[PDB]
Amino acid sequence: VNKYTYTSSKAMSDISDVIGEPLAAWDSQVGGRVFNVIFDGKVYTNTYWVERWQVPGIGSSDGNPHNAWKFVRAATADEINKIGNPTTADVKPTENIPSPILVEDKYTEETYSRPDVNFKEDGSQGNLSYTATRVCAPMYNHYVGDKTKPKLSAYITDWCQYDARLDGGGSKEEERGRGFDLATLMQNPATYDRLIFSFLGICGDIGNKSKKVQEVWDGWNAQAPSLGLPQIGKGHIVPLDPYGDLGTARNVGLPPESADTSIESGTFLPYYQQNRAAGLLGGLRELQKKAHAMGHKLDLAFSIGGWSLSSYFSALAENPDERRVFVASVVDFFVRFPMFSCVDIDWEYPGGGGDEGNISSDKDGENYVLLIKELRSALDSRFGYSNRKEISIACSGVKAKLKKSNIDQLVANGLDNIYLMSYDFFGTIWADYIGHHTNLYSPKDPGEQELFDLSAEAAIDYLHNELGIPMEKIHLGYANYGRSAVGGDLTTRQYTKNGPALGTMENGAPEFFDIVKNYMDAEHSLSMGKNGFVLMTDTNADADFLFSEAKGHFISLDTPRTVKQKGEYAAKNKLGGVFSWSGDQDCGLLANAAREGLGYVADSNQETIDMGPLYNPGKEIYLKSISEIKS
């Protein structure tokens, strides 16, 4: 564990029981040692870790993100003379850089140079960047066992796979794609307690991508007779791309040995098992092996359904036997990959919502409850209690449709956990006004917090108070991308609708790591807006954001400080658990901060990198709520 010492002295005659400490002016104090520094004639002790932006002045009953930088005013004028009393200051980014942060990518520079991309730091010549995640550094400190705190998790997805810039590419967005090697986390495993691969699917799904469903169903049905195995209809679960999952070596922390990447949908099927599992999923299995080599086993998991593949949920509803066959395929998958700690479902619309392709009825929620109970039953019928699985679903926070979800009966039917989608509240391309797509906290004037100012706390209170559900059964997290909006006016939150907005790959969805590259910095031990792009924070909702005047472009985003705020709240609550959505694109600094928000403590005096200076607030402002502005 980390350890630190200090000392104090007195005359041989005088022994204070208290830690005597040199009386001095405040100036950029930091750390754990006692400080009684003086400022504005007052005398101030931060009885908590000290940070170079923390200020005792405001600190009199403030000065740390949680409590009073307490004070006395014992100092006399001649003390205020022998020590030149401070009365104001401003911490600056230091001149040096205590730690490297990232490395350039040849191909990303080439990308910017591409005559279609034409990307520029200001985005003037190019609104998108398609920046390779390879730019990133490992960036993970190390931490104590800290067993009591709620579990930590992260989401993971297939977009880890490819960027043909590694192969030259140069003509199309995926040639300018994204991806990273899990070797990263392998370097220091146990970075999380649980993981969730992206929602996969089933035969018969309805959405745009369904040609993939067709192809794989074909491959399966072709293989099945040759394997001497029964054919499958709709509702059977799909692996989507076994070639990615297993027919891989790059980005999956494993030598190219045995990577028969040639194998695919028409041929993988024998390999569709953990023992045989090459590529990504296998790599995960070995990662867990390493993890256990340490101890503290990860809950390896995934789910199915989700934003873009939910379409068949209604269709499968009220087809009980097909639903049975589907969950049969579920448990079969468990048998094929008993490695998994559990897996879950990503139904998203008891009442219709999201993409319209998710056809839906009213009864959907009820039927969903029913089938859910039936699933639970099937699982229990399958599993041995010594190895039991316990299921979770997310929730959308749609104040009404969440009610329509009948969480009460789901709990009564052994659905153990809930993960609140805490992000993208700001449907920036269509939303009426700019807002924080992920605000936990209620801004002032809750009069309009119905399709806006969607403080997750409101739903939280619904479940806790208005539904009695223990926090244990509910989980929350954060995502590693902000929103970006054209022409926004900070006073009115009005903004240029439809106008194309910043993303490396996804317009309107600025990507955290590349934001670290382009717009924000910390190399000088601080939270540092850079390249002329405004660093900013709102007092109304504890909101945090970024701006650029030349295109009135705004970005709402979580931050180290803001996810810290989040984790601290969740921790003070003792929520069921903490996680991060879209974990695929943070260096890990936000994870270190998340540990901090969890109160999860580091285990050594050494660091991968610092984190304290990342919690200075941005340019302070008060932003009126939508209701306040309209009123």
């Binding site: 040639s262 194998i263 028409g266 041929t267």
Partner: protein, 146 residues
């Protein structure tokens, strides 16, 4: 130097002549994923010609891949009798023969009869039973061999 036994390179069989003879285009219409698995051949191909056709005649045109020796038989079933909208059809096959002959496989588009064979055609001889070097050698230094 001296060498080793003859050894099967247990991977994708290698190149041999394509014998391109398509009606409406060059060999470059074709694409071929030559490969192998578990002691048996596997390969996947596509010929980008369908959209050109006057499906009034070219409807249900035989599209696929089939081995043909001097018999030039049609003992295969991967023939995609293309719809007038099969603008980019994928044909996919595997084979299992002990004789590691560099067998010719006619592939692409053909009608069941009549000279009309709208689109790309090729008679690709594959090559199989390939090997690899292992380069180890004497050297001379002055008069003294090493």
């Amino acid at each position: 130097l001296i060498l080793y036994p003859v050894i099967i390179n247990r991977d994708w069989p290698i190149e041999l002549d394509k014998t391109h003879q398509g009606d409406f285009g060059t060999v470059d219409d074709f694409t071929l994923n030559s490969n192998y698995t578990g002691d048996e051949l596997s390969l996947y191909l596509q010929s980008s010609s369908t959209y050109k056709y006057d499906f009034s005649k070219s409807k249900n045109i035989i599209y696929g891949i089939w081995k043909e020796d001097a018999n030039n038989n049609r003992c295969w079933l991967n023939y995609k009798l293309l719809t007038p909208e099969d603008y980019e059809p994928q044909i996919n096959a595997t084979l299992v023969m002990c004789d590691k002959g560099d067998v010719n496989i006619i592939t692409g588009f053909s009608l069941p009869n009549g000279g009309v064979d709208a689109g790309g055609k090729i008679k690709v001889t594959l090559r199989v039973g390939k090997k690899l070097r292992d380069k180890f050698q004497i050297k001379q230094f002055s008069q003294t061999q090493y």
